[PDB]
Design an enzyme around this catalytic site. Sequence first.
Site, PDB file in Angstrom:
ATOM      1  CB  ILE A  71     -32.113 -51.932 -26.024  1.00 56.38           C
ATOM      2  CG1 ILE A  71     -31.216 -52.913 -26.808  1.00 56.38           C
ATOM      3  CG2 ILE A  71     -31.961 -52.191 -24.498  1.00 56.38           C
ATOM      4  CD1 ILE A  71     -29.772 -52.680 -26.629  1.00 56.38           C
ATOM      5  CD  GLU A 160     -28.361 -48.176 -34.256  1.00 54.10           C
ATOM      6  OE1 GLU A 160     -29.062 -48.574 -35.227  1.00 54.10           O
ATOM      7  OE2 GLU A 160     -28.660 -47.134 -33.598  1.00 54.10           O
ATOM      8  NE  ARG A 163     -32.663 -50.700 -35.464  1.00 53.40           N
ATOM      9  CZ  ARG A 163     -32.692 -49.989 -34.339  1.00 53.40           C
ATOM     10  NH1 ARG A 163     -31.651 -49.193 -34.019  1.00 53.40           N
ATOM     11  NH2 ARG A 163     -33.699 -50.133 -33.501  1.00 53.40           N
TER      12      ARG A 163
END
Lengths: 247, 10
Positions: A71, A160, A163
Amino acid sequence: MVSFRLSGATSSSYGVFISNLRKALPNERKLYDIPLLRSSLPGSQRYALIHLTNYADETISVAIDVTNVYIMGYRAGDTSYFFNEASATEAAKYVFKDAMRKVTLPYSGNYERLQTAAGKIRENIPLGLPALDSAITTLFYYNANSAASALMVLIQSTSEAARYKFIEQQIGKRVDKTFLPSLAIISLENSWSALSKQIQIASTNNGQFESPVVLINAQNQRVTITNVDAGVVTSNIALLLNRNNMA
Amino acid sequence: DDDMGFGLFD
């Protein structure tokens, strides 16, 4: 292009959100069926906007670098807010240009600085869909005293989650409550760059890591990942940071 | 699926 509304959010609608975010990221190829991100793109192609809408129908637009899903900054109405780091200064040449007010956040996008700024470690910040809704609200009004915490919520619920399937599922399962993230989740976040690097190396090294990656599992045990048969490779990691994303 | 994350690590 990618949008998510917290109003009426389900575990499912959250999964659709995170699959769309993943899908919006270019890849070089896949390795072991895990998309490998591009190392580098031209500035004009490097940033994407994610739109998130709280229960009150207030929207923040979040800029991410599609090579690494970091970000860079966010926009709320006429105000842009960018991390105090070179990666974000660069993004601010391409995104949120018609923002009337441009703020530089007093920290970099790095969990150590964010934690110092929040006076809080991640293990004590709640997560969940209602947590994401308060983050949006907090950031829409820019409480400078609550913003760093709310950036850690935001980061984990987008970047996250994108991911790691484990992070995704764990957040999206908290639909009407919140939870404190385990050391497992934290470990996975901390270890993304190194695990990614090791899986790349394994790809020309018969599935062997060159260097062990130590993770914490959901029983809080220290476990050593040295190859592509690890559950974290076959059933969790969903994006590989390219080893050439930085010099 | 749980919170036990069985098989998602090592």
